[PDB]
Amino acid sequence: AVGACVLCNSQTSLRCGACIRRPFLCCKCCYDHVISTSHKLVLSVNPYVCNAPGCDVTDVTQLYLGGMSYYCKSHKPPISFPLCANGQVFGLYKVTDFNAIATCDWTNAGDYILANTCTERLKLFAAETLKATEETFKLSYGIATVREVLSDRELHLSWEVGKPRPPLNRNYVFTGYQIGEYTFEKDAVVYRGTTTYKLNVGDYVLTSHTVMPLSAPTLVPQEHYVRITGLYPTLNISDEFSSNVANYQKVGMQKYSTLQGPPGTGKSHFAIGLALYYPSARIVYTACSHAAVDALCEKALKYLPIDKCSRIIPARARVECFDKFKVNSTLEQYVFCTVNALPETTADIVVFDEISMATNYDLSVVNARLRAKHYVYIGDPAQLPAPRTLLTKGTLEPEYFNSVCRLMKTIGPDMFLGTCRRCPAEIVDTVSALVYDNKLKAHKDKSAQCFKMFYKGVITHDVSSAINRPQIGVVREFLTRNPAWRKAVFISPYNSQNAVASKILGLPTQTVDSSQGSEYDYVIFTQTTETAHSCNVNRFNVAITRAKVGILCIMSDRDLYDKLQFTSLEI
Ligand SMILES: [Zn+2]
Ligand SMILES: [Zn+2]
Ligand SMILES: [Zn+2]
């Protein structure tokens, strides 16, 4: 019951009992929370409530200080002072944005906009409130019961009555009962057991968690040094990494640094190269996803001592991680760990990659568990953000993804990798104009294997996941005449479309959001629909920037189709 205001940092003992995170408020600000919102319960060592028997008066605007206890207007003694007096609430040591953040439901984009345009402490209140609201609601979907078990990879499901049903994507992970975590893909449903337990009938919940509080800021205050501080540069750096030396120096002359790395521009190369320039430094490589850390591991396995590297895995192990480094050895000079599994340690340089996919919660967790001399944030605000499962009204723009992306979109990034080495020029040219203001350059020539076709087709829906069978049919007609594409990866914005494409075409499939950070020779993309999800420029950017040799885009949107600097196909 001891703390300081979360708005002006004035110590007090008053906590709001209506806020889900019960923050500490001083006497001057508590008055504005209570007199401007619906939040009227104030908490202290003793609940501010009428102490008279049988009274339900909890509104502090209706309460009075009588003697040492608190009473309402119908029970207060003659000599009593109003608790809410002189723009203050009685407490020891005797706001609009805070009010919005405290009263919002996190379903509108404006909520997330405020949560990133506010003060740091407010940013941390919003983050923890959001996570809480996300969790307190994950308990309101129906439960799953197995009708019949057909194969080892497919089941029949029966859903509970009264509650809504959660979608069947990997984003919606489930805990089985403790038979292990499970994911489902949309009659028959495909099941994926983190273990090889033969899911039987009579078996049966959405994963959840407990919102631990936060303490560290999203970004530590910036520090600009006069020279490389805390690190010892080499003087014989491989020529393969020589282009990044001027950037590798800025990292050492600053507390934190921002790198915008468009697709195929060499982000992982910059990351592992930072260690070769500082060969004595302890480096923690972290990201929110397991695939990102594994990508950084695979890159290290080529340029770094395989004996100074460790892949930290959570004891609760769902996906397969990297199995070529020492597992769970925090003592190594090179530690590769997801944010949630971060140990409480120290380092010289911390590298946080895939920053577009980070939440302000993740950023705080890192600035806490990891105390370091230099933090490096690598990503691209023109790529996809982390899913905000409560956001249903409005679109979150890149400047509101997190604090780092806001910086990259407002003041600019500290470093910008401007040469794409992966994609054919046709792709590079298209994205450079679409999201990079023509600042992205192409190293490769035009492949002449980048084609586009405008075909709206027919849109069917499995619940809400979209499907366009006619667009799959067009792809089938294309594969019969382009054999070199039988190895192509099918990519779409919809899981259901991918499922239908797997069966009809036989190609490996991937959603755009799951394709992020992956590269492929040939890519086949069907927009499937003309929706805000299907036409998002970040999503379209990621999708087409996956191809190294060729791409075929079956388009549903006239604008994005015209912008594709590809050869048009007819059929
Ligand atoms: Zn205050
Ligand atoms: Zn409140
Ligand atoms: Zn009373």
Coordinates of C-alpha atoms and ligand atoms in Angstrom, one line a residue:
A1 CA 0.0 0.0 0.0
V2 CA 3.1 2.2 -0.3
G3 CA 4.0 3.7 -3.7
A4 CA 4.1 6.9 -5.8
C5 CA 1.8 8.4 -8.3
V6 CA 1.9 6.8 -11.8
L7 CA 1.5 10.3 -13.3
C8 CA 3.7 12.7 -11.3
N9 CA 5.6 10.2 -9.2
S10 CA 4.4 11.7 -5.9
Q11 CA 4.4 9.1 -3.2
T12 CA 1.1 8.1 -1.7
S13 CA -1.0 5.2 -0.4
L14 CA -4.0 5.6 -2.6
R15 CA -4.7 2.9 -5.3
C16 CA -7.6 2.8 -7.7
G17 CA -9.8 -0.2 -7.1
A18 CA -11.5 0.0 -10.5
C19 CA -8.3 -0.1 -12.6
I20 CA -7.5 -3.7 -13.4
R21 CA -3.8 -3.1 -12.5
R22 CA -4.7 -1.1 -9.3
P23 CA -2.0 1.6 -9.8
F24 CA -0.8 4.1 -7.2
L25 CA -2.2 7.6 -7.5
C26 CA -1.3 10.8 -5.6
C27 CA -4.0 12.9 -4.0
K28 CA -4.2 15.5 -6.8
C29 CA -4.5 13.0 -9.7
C30 CA -6.8 10.5 -7.9
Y31 CA -9.3 13.3 -7.9
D32 CA -9.3 13.5 -11.7
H33 CA -9.5 9.7 -12.2
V34 CA -12.5 9.5 -9.9
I35 CA -14.3 12.7 -11.0
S36 CA -13.8 12.2 -14.7
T37 CA -14.3 8.4 -15.1
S38 CA -16.6 5.7 -13.7
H39 CA -13.8 4.6 -11.3
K40 CA -14.9 5.6 -7.8
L41 CA -13.4 2.9 -5.5
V42 CA -10.1 4.1 -3.9
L43 CA -7.9 1.6 -2.1
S44 CA -5.4 2.0 0.7
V45 CA -4.3 0.0 3.7
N46 CA -8.0 0.1 4.4
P47 CA -10.7 0.2 1.7
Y48 CA -12.2 3.6 1.4
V49 CA -15.8 2.6 2.1
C50 CA -18.5 3.5 4.6
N51 CA -17.7 1.7 7.8
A52 CA -21.3 1.8 9.0
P53 CA -23.1 -1.6 9.2
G54 CA -25.0 -2.5 6.1
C55 CA -23.8 0.3 3.9
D56 CA -22.8 -0.3 0.3
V57 CA -21.5 3.2 -0.3
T58 CA -18.1 2.8 -2.1
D59 CA -18.0 6.0 -4.2
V60 CA -15.3 8.3 -2.7
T61 CA -17.2 11.3 -4.0
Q62 CA -20.0 10.3 -1.6
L63 CA -17.7 9.5 1.4
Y64 CA -16.5 11.5 4.3
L65 CA -13.7 11.4 6.9
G66 CA -15.3 11.0 10.4
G67 CA -12.9 10.5 13.2
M68 CA -10.5 7.9 11.9
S69 CA -13.0 5.9 9.8
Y70 CA -14.9 6.8 6.6
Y71 CA -18.7 7.2 6.3
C72 CA -21.3 8.3 3.8
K73 CA -23.6 11.4 4.1
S74 CA -26.2 9.3 5.9
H75 CA -23.8 7.9 8.5
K76 CA -21.1 10.6 9.0
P77 CA -20.7 12.3 12.4
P78 CA -21.3 16.0 12.8
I79 CA -17.5 16.8 12.5
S80 CA -16.6 15.2 9.1
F81 CA -14.5 16.3 6.2
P82 CA -15.3 15.2 2.6
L83 CA -12.8 12.8 1.3
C84 CA -12.9 14.3 -2.2
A85 CA -12.1 17.9 -1.2
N86 CA -10.3 20.8 -2.8
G87 CA -9.4 18.9 -6.0
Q88 CA -7.8 16.3 -3.8
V89 CA -8.6 12.9 -2.2
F90 CA -7.7 12.5 1.5
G91 CA -4.4 10.5 1.7
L92 CA -0.9 10.8 2.9
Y93 CA 1.6 13.5 1.7
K94 CA -1.4 15.7 0.8
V95 CA -4.6 12.7 -16.5
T96 CA -7.0 12.6 -19.5
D97 CA -4.7 10.2 -21.3
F98 CA -4.4 8.1 -18.1
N99 CA -8.2 8.1 -17.9
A100 CA -8.6 6.9 -21.5
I101 CA -5.9 4.2 -20.9
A102 CA -7.7 3.1 -17.7
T103 CA -11.2 3.0 -19.1
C104 CA -10.7 1.7 -22.7
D105 CA -11.4 -1.9 -23.8
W106 CA -8.5 -2.1 -26.3
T107 CA -10.7 -2.9 -29.2
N108 CA -10.0 0.4 -31.0
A109 CA -6.9 1.5 -32.7
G110 CA -7.0 4.8 -30.9
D111 CA -6.3 2.9 -27.7
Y112 CA -3.0 1.6 -29.1
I113 CA -2.2 5.0 -30.5
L114 CA -2.5 6.6 -27.1
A115 CA -0.5 3.8 -25.5
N116 CA 2.5 4.9 -27.6
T117 CA 2.1 8.7 -27.7
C118 CA 1.9 9.0 -23.9
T119 CA 4.6 9.3 -21.2
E120 CA 6.9 6.4 -20.4
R121 CA 5.2 5.4 -17.1
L122 CA 1.8 5.7 -18.9
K123 CA 3.3 3.5 -21.7
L124 CA 4.1 0.9 -19.1
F125 CA 0.6 1.1 -17.4
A126 CA -1.1 0.7 -20.8
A127 CA 1.1 -2.3 -21.6
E128 CA 0.3 -4.2 -18.4
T129 CA -3.3 -3.2 -18.6
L130 CA -3.5 -4.4 -22.2
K131 CA -1.9 -7.7 -21.3
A132 CA -4.2 -8.2 -18.4
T133 CA -7.3 -7.4 -20.5
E134 CA -6.0 -9.8 -23.1
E135 CA -5.7 -12.5 -20.5
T136 CA -8.8 -11.9 -18.4
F137 CA -10.7 -12.4 -21.7
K138 CA -8.9 -15.5 -23.1
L139 CA -11.0 -17.4 -20.5
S140 CA -14.3 -16.6 -22.3
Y141 CA -14.2 -18.9 -25.3
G142 CA -15.6 -22.4 -25.5
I143 CA -13.9 -25.7 -24.7
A144 CA -13.1 -28.4 -27.1
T145 CA -14.1 -32.1 -26.9
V146 CA -12.9 -34.8 -29.3
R147 CA -15.7 -36.5 -31.2
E148 CA -13.6 -39.1 -33.0
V149 CA -9.9 -39.6 -33.7
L150 CA -9.4 -40.5 -37.3
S151 CA -5.6 -40.4 -37.9
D152 CA -2.5 -39.2 -36.0
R153 CA -2.9 -35.7 -37.5
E154 CA -6.6 -35.2 -37.7
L155 CA -9.5 -35.3 -35.3
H156 CA -13.3 -34.6 -35.0
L157 CA -14.1 -31.8 -32.6
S158 CA -17.2 -30.9 -30.5
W159 CA -17.6 -27.4 -29.0
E160 CA -19.2 -26.2 -25.8
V161 CA -22.6 -24.4 -25.9
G162 CA -23.0 -20.9 -24.6
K163 CA -19.5 -19.5 -25.4
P164 CA -18.0 -18.4 -28.7
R165 CA -15.5 -20.6 -30.5
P166 CA -11.8 -19.6 -30.9
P167 CA -10.5 -19.6 -34.5
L168 CA -8.3 -22.6 -35.6
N169 CA -4.9 -21.0 -36.3
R170 CA -1.5 -21.5 -34.7
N171 CA -1.9 -18.0 -33.3
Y172 CA -4.6 -19.6 -31.1
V173 CA -2.6 -22.2 -29.2
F174 CA -4.4 -24.6 -26.8
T175 CA -3.4 -26.6 -23.7
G176 CA -4.5 -30.2 -23.7
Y177 CA -5.5 -32.3 -20.7
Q178 CA -1.7 -32.3 -19.1
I179 CA -1.3 -33.9 -22.6
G180 CA 0.7 -31.0 -23.8
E181 CA 0.1 -27.9 -25.9
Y182 CA -1.9 -28.2 -29.1
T183 CA -2.8 -26.3 -32.2
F184 CA -5.7 -26.9 -34.6
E185 CA -6.3 -26.2 -38.3
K186 CA -9.7 -26.1 -39.9
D187 CA -15.5 -30.9 -41.2
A188 CA -12.3 -32.6 -40.0
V189 CA -9.8 -30.6 -38.0
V190 CA -6.0 -31.2 -38.2
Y191 CA -4.4 -31.5 -34.7
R192 CA -0.7 -30.8 -33.8
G193 CA 0.5 -32.4 -30.5
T194 CA 3.7 -30.9 -29.1
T195 CA 4.1 -34.6 -28.0
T196 CA 3.4 -37.9 -29.8
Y197 CA 0.5 -38.7 -27.4
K198 CA -2.2 -40.5 -29.3
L199 CA -5.0 -38.0 -28.7
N200 CA -8.0 -40.2 -27.6
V201 CA -11.8 -39.3 -27.3
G202 CA -13.1 -37.9 -24.1
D203 CA -10.1 -35.7 -24.1
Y204 CA -10.4 -31.9 -23.9
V205 CA -8.3 -25.2 -23.1
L206 CA -7.0 -22.0 -24.7
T207 CA -3.5 -21.2 -23.4
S208 CA -3.2 -18.3 -20.9
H209 CA -0.8 -16.7 -18.4
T210 CA -0.5 -14.4 -15.4
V211 CA 0.4 -10.8 -16.1
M212 CA 3.5 -10.1 -14.0
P213 CA 4.0 -6.4 -13.3
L214 CA 6.6 -4.2 -15.2
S215 CA 9.3 -1.9 -13.9
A216 CA 11.8 -1.1 -16.6
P217 CA 11.1 1.4 -19.4
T218 CA 10.6 0.4 -23.0
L219 CA 13.8 2.3 -24.0
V220 CA 16.5 3.2 -21.5
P221 CA 17.3 6.9 -21.6
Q222 CA 19.6 7.7 -24.5
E223 CA 23.3 8.2 -23.9
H224 CA 25.7 9.6 -26.6
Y225 CA 29.4 9.0 -25.9
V226 CA 32.4 10.7 -27.4
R227 CA 34.1 7.4 -28.3
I228 CA 33.5 3.6 -28.2
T229 CA 32.7 3.0 -24.6
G230 CA 32.8 -0.4 -22.9
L231 CA 33.9 -2.3 -26.0
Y232 CA 37.2 -3.2 -27.6
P233 CA 37.3 -3.0 -31.4
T234 CA 39.3 -5.3 -33.6
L235 CA 41.6 -4.1 -36.4
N236 CA 41.4 -7.2 -38.6
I237 CA 37.7 -7.6 -39.5
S238 CA 36.9 -9.8 -42.4
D239 CA 36.1 -7.9 -45.6
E240 CA 32.7 -9.7 -45.6
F241 CA 31.8 -7.4 -42.7
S242 CA 33.9 -4.3 -43.6
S243 CA 30.9 -2.4 -45.0
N244 CA 29.3 -2.3 -41.5
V245 CA 32.3 -0.9 -39.6
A246 CA 31.1 2.7 -39.6
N247 CA 27.7 1.4 -38.2
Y248 CA 29.5 -0.9 -35.8
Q249 CA 31.2 2.2 -34.4
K250 CA 28.0 4.1 -33.9
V251 CA 26.7 1.2 -31.8
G252 CA 29.6 1.8 -29.4
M253 CA 29.2 5.5 -29.2
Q254 CA 25.5 5.4 -28.1
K255 CA 23.5 3.6 -25.4
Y256 CA 20.9 2.2 -27.8
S257 CA 20.8 2.1 -31.6
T258 CA 18.1 1.6 -34.3
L259 CA 18.6 -0.3 -37.5
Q260 CA 15.9 -0.3 -40.3
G261 CA 16.6 -3.4 -42.3
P262 CA 14.4 -4.0 -45.3
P263 CA 14.1 -7.6 -46.6
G264 CA 17.3 -9.2 -47.8
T265 CA 19.5 -6.3 -46.8
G266 CA 21.6 -8.2 -44.3
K267 CA 20.2 -7.8 -40.8
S268 CA 21.5 -11.2 -39.5
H269 CA 24.8 -10.4 -41.2
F270 CA 25.0 -7.1 -39.3
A271 CA 24.1 -8.9 -36.1
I272 CA 26.7 -11.6 -36.1
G273 CA 29.3 -9.2 -37.6
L274 CA 28.9 -7.0 -34.5
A275 CA 30.5 -9.8 -32.5
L276 CA 33.4 -10.2 -35.0
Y277 CA 34.1 -6.5 -34.5
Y278 CA 33.9 -6.9 -30.7
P279 CA 35.4 -10.4 -30.3
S280 CA 35.6 -10.1 -26.5
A281 CA 32.1 -8.8 -25.8
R282 CA 29.3 -10.9 -24.3
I283 CA 26.3 -10.7 -26.6
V284 CA 22.8 -11.7 -25.9
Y285 CA 20.8 -12.3 -29.1
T286 CA 17.0 -12.1 -28.4
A287 CA 13.8 -12.0 -30.2
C288 CA 10.1 -12.6 -29.5
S289 CA 9.8 -15.7 -31.7
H290 CA 11.7 -19.0 -31.7
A291 CA 12.2 -18.8 -35.4
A292 CA 14.0 -15.5 -35.2
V293 CA 16.4 -16.8 -32.6
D294 CA 17.0 -19.9 -34.7
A295 CA 17.7 -17.7 -37.7
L296 CA 20.3 -15.9 -35.7
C297 CA 21.8 -19.1 -34.4
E298 CA 22.1 -20.6 -37.9
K299 CA 24.0 -17.4 -38.9
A300 CA 26.3 -17.6 -35.9
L301 CA 27.0 -21.3 -36.6
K302 CA 29.0 -20.1 -39.6
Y303 CA 31.1 -17.1 -38.3
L304 CA 31.3 -17.7 -34.5
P305 CA 33.0 -20.2 -32.2
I306 CA 30.5 -23.0 -31.7
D307 CA 31.8 -23.4 -28.2
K308 CA 31.0 -19.9 -26.9
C309 CA 27.4 -20.2 -28.0
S310 CA 24.3 -21.4 -26.1
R311 CA 20.6 -21.7 -27.2
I312 CA 18.4 -21.2 -24.1
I313 CA 15.1 -23.1 -24.3
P314 CA 12.1 -22.7 -22.0
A315 CA 11.4 -25.8 -19.9
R316 CA 7.9 -25.6 -21.4
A317 CA 9.1 -26.7 -24.9
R318 CA 6.6 -26.4 -27.7
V319 CA 8.4 -25.9 -31.0
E320 CA 11.8 -27.5 -31.9
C321 CA 14.6 -25.0 -31.3
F322 CA 18.2 -25.0 -32.6
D323 CA 20.0 -28.3 -31.8
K324 CA 23.6 -27.5 -32.6
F325 CA 24.7 -25.2 -29.7
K326 CA 24.9 -25.9 -25.9
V327 CA 21.4 -25.9 -24.5
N328 CA 20.6 -23.8 -21.4
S329 CA 24.2 -22.5 -20.7
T330 CA 23.8 -18.9 -19.7
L331 CA 27.5 -18.7 -19.0
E332 CA 28.5 -18.6 -22.7
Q333 CA 29.7 -15.5 -24.4
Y334 CA 27.0 -15.9 -27.0
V335 CA 23.5 -16.5 -25.7
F336 CA 20.5 -17.0 -28.1
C337 CA 17.2 -16.7 -26.2
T338 CA 13.6 -15.7 -26.7
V339 CA 12.4 -12.7 -24.7
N340 CA 10.1 -14.8 -22.5
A341 CA 12.9 -17.2 -21.5
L342 CA 15.5 -14.4 -20.9
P343 CA 17.6 -14.9 -17.7
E344 CA 18.4 -12.1 -15.3
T345 CA 21.9 -11.4 -16.5
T346 CA 24.4 -8.8 -17.8
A347 CA 26.1 -8.2 -21.2
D348 CA 28.1 -5.8 -23.2
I349 CA 25.8 -5.7 -26.2
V350 CA 22.1 -6.8 -26.4
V351 CA 20.7 -7.4 -29.9
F352 CA 16.9 -7.5 -30.2
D353 CA 15.9 -8.5 -33.7
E354 CA 12.4 -8.6 -35.4
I355 CA 11.5 -5.5 -33.5
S356 CA 8.4 -4.9 -35.6
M357 CA 7.0 -8.0 -33.9
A358 CA 7.7 -6.6 -30.4
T359 CA 5.2 -5.2 -27.9
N360 CA 6.0 -2.5 -25.4
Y361 CA 5.7 -5.3 -22.8
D362 CA 8.5 -7.3 -24.5
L363 CA 10.7 -4.2 -24.6
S364 CA 10.3 -3.6 -20.9
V365 CA 11.0 -7.3 -20.0
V366 CA 14.3 -7.0 -21.9
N367 CA 15.4 -3.7 -20.3
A368 CA 14.8 -5.5 -17.0
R369 CA 16.2 -9.0 -17.2
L370 CA 19.2 -7.8 -19.2
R371 CA 21.4 -5.0 -17.9
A372 CA 23.9 -4.0 -20.6
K373 CA 26.2 -1.3 -22.0
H374 CA 24.7 -1.2 -25.5
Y375 CA 21.3 -2.4 -26.8
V376 CA 20.8 -2.8 -30.5
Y377 CA 17.3 -2.9 -32.0
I378 CA 17.1 -4.4 -35.5
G379 CA 13.9 -4.6 -37.6
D380 CA 11.7 -3.0 -40.1
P381 CA 8.5 -1.0 -39.4
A382 CA 7.4 -1.8 -43.0
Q383 CA 7.0 -5.4 -42.1
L384 CA 4.3 -7.1 -39.9
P385 CA 3.5 -6.3 -36.3
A386 CA 2.6 -8.6 -33.5
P387 CA -1.1 -9.6 -33.6
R388 CA -3.3 -7.6 -31.3
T389 CA -6.2 -10.0 -30.8
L390 CA -8.4 -7.5 -29.1
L391 CA -8.1 -4.8 -31.8
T392 CA -11.1 -5.1 -34.1
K393 CA -11.9 -1.5 -35.1
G394 CA -9.3 0.5 -37.0
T395 CA -5.8 -0.2 -38.3
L396 CA -2.6 0.1 -36.3
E397 CA 0.0 2.1 -38.3
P398 CA 3.7 1.3 -38.1
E399 CA 4.5 4.3 -36.0
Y400 CA 2.3 2.8 -33.2
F401 CA 3.7 -0.7 -33.2
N402 CA 6.1 0.0 -30.3
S403 CA 8.5 2.6 -29.0
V404 CA 11.3 1.7 -31.4
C405 CA 9.1 1.7 -34.5
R406 CA 7.7 5.0 -33.4
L407 CA 11.3 6.4 -33.3
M408 CA 12.1 4.8 -36.7
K409 CA 9.0 6.5 -38.2
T410 CA 9.3 9.9 -36.5
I411 CA 13.0 10.9 -36.1
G412 CA 14.4 8.2 -38.3
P413 CA 16.5 5.1 -37.7
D414 CA 20.1 5.3 -36.7
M415 CA 21.2 3.0 -39.5
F416 CA 19.5 1.9 -42.7
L417 CA 20.5 -1.0 -44.9
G418 CA 19.6 0.2 -48.4
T419 CA 20.6 -2.7 -50.8
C420 CA 18.4 -5.7 -51.2
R421 CA 20.5 -8.7 -52.3
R422 CA 17.8 -11.4 -52.2
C423 CA 15.0 -10.3 -54.5
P424 CA 14.8 -9.8 -58.3
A425 CA 14.8 -6.1 -59.3
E426 CA 11.1 -6.2 -60.2
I427 CA 10.2 -7.0 -56.6
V428 CA 12.7 -4.5 -55.1
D429 CA 11.5 -1.7 -57.4
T430 CA 7.9 -2.3 -56.3
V431 CA 8.4 -2.4 -52.6
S432 CA 10.9 0.5 -52.6
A433 CA 8.2 2.8 -54.0
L434 CA 5.4 1.3 -51.9
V435 CA 6.9 1.6 -48.4
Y436 CA 10.5 2.7 -48.6
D437 CA 10.1 6.0 -50.4
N438 CA 12.4 4.8 -53.2
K439 CA 15.4 4.4 -50.8
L440 CA 15.7 0.7 -51.3
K441 CA 18.1 -0.4 -54.0
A442 CA 18.4 -3.6 -56.0
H443 CA 21.6 -5.6 -56.3
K444 CA 20.1 -8.3 -58.5
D445 CA 18.9 -7.8 -62.1
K446 CA 15.3 -8.2 -63.2
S447 CA 14.6 -11.9 -63.2
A448 CA 12.0 -11.9 -65.9
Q449 CA 10.3 -14.6 -63.8
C450 CA 8.0 -12.2 -61.9
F451 CA 4.4 -12.4 -63.2
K452 CA 1.1 -10.9 -62.1
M453 CA -2.6 -11.6 -63.0
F454 CA -5.8 -9.8 -62.0
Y455 CA -8.5 -12.4 -61.3
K456 CA -11.1 -11.7 -58.6
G457 CA -12.5 -15.3 -58.7
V458 CA -15.1 -16.4 -56.1
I459 CA -14.7 -15.9 -52.3
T460 CA -16.0 -18.5 -50.0
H461 CA -15.5 -18.5 -46.2
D462 CA -14.8 -21.2 -43.6
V463 CA -16.4 -19.3 -40.7
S464 CA -14.4 -16.1 -41.5
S465 CA -11.2 -17.5 -43.0
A466 CA -11.4 -16.7 -46.8
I467 CA -11.0 -19.1 -49.7
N468 CA -10.8 -18.4 -53.4
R469 CA -11.0 -21.8 -55.3
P470 CA -10.9 -20.1 -58.8
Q471 CA -7.6 -18.5 -57.9
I472 CA -6.2 -21.9 -57.0
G473 CA -7.5 -23.2 -60.3
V474 CA -5.6 -20.5 -62.2
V475 CA -2.4 -21.5 -60.4
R476 CA -3.0 -25.1 -61.3
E477 CA -3.3 -24.1 -65.0
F478 CA 0.0 -22.2 -64.6
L479 CA 1.9 -25.0 -63.0
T480 CA 1.0 -27.4 -65.8
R481 CA 2.8 -25.0 -68.2
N482 CA 5.6 -23.8 -65.9
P483 CA 7.3 -26.9 -64.6
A484 CA 10.2 -25.1 -62.9
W485 CA 7.5 -23.8 -60.4
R486 CA 6.5 -27.2 -59.1
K487 CA 9.0 -26.4 -56.2
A488 CA 7.2 -23.1 -55.4
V489 CA 5.9 -22.2 -52.0
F490 CA 2.2 -21.3 -51.9
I491 CA 1.6 -18.1 -49.8
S492 CA -1.7 -16.5 -49.0
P493 CA -3.1 -14.2 -46.3
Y494 CA -5.5 -16.9 -45.2
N495 CA -5.0 -20.3 -43.5
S496 CA -8.1 -21.8 -45.1
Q497 CA -6.9 -20.9 -48.6
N498 CA -3.6 -22.4 -47.8
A499 CA -5.3 -25.6 -46.7
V500 CA -7.3 -25.8 -49.9
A501 CA -4.1 -25.1 -51.9
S502 CA -2.2 -27.9 -50.2
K503 CA -4.8 -30.4 -51.3
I504 CA -5.3 -29.3 -54.9
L505 CA -1.7 -28.2 -55.8
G506 CA 0.4 -30.2 -53.4
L507 CA 2.9 -27.3 -52.8
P508 CA 4.2 -26.4 -49.4
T509 CA 2.1 -23.6 -48.0
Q510 CA 2.7 -20.6 -45.7
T511 CA 0.7 -17.7 -44.5
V512 CA 2.4 -14.3 -45.2
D513 CA 2.7 -13.6 -41.5
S514 CA 4.4 -16.9 -40.9
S515 CA 6.6 -16.5 -44.0
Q516 CA 8.3 -13.4 -42.4
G517 CA 12.1 -13.9 -42.2
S518 CA 12.0 -16.9 -44.6
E519 CA 13.2 -16.9 -48.2
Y520 CA 12.3 -19.1 -51.1
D521 CA 13.3 -19.4 -54.8
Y522 CA 9.8 -19.4 -56.2
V523 CA 6.7 -18.0 -54.5
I524 CA 3.0 -18.3 -55.6
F525 CA 0.7 -15.7 -54.0
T526 CA -3.1 -15.5 -54.2
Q527 CA -4.5 -12.4 -52.5
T528 CA -7.7 -14.4 -52.0
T529 CA -9.8 -11.3 -51.1
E530 CA -10.0 -7.5 -51.3
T531 CA -10.0 -6.7 -47.5
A532 CA -8.0 -4.5 -45.3
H533 CA -6.1 -7.6 -44.2
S534 CA -5.4 -8.7 -47.8
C535 CA -4.4 -5.2 -49.0
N536 CA -2.3 -4.1 -46.0
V537 CA 0.9 -2.7 -47.5
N538 CA 3.2 -4.2 -44.8
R539 CA 1.7 -7.7 -45.4
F540 CA 1.9 -7.3 -49.2
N541 CA 5.6 -6.1 -48.8
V542 CA 6.6 -9.2 -46.7
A543 CA 4.7 -11.6 -49.1
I544 CA 6.4 -10.6 -52.3
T545 CA 9.8 -9.9 -50.7
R546 CA 10.1 -13.7 -50.0
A547 CA 11.1 -14.7 -53.5
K548 CA 14.7 -15.0 -54.6
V549 CA 14.1 -16.0 -58.3
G550 CA 10.5 -15.7 -59.3
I551 CA 7.0 -14.9 -58.1
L552 CA 3.5 -15.2 -59.4
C553 CA 0.9 -12.9 -57.9
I554 CA -2.8 -13.7 -58.5
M555 CA -4.3 -10.3 -57.5
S556 CA -7.7 -9.3 -56.3
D557 CA -7.1 -5.6 -55.7
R558 CA -6.7 -3.2 -58.7
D559 CA -4.3 -0.8 -56.9
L560 CA -1.8 -3.3 -55.6
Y561 CA -2.0 -5.1 -59.0
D562 CA -1.2 -2.0 -61.0
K563 CA 1.7 -1.2 -58.7
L564 CA 3.3 -4.6 -59.3
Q565 CA 6.1 -4.0 -61.8
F566 CA 5.7 -7.5 -63.2
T567 CA 4.8 -9.0 -66.5
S568 CA 1.1 -9.5 -66.8
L569 CA -0.2 -13.0 -67.7
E570 CA -3.5 -13.8 -69.4
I571 CA -5.9 -16.7 -68.9
Ligands
ZN1 ZN 0.0 12.5 -9.6
ZN2 ZN -9.2 3.1 -12.1
ZN3 ZN -23.1 4.8 5.1

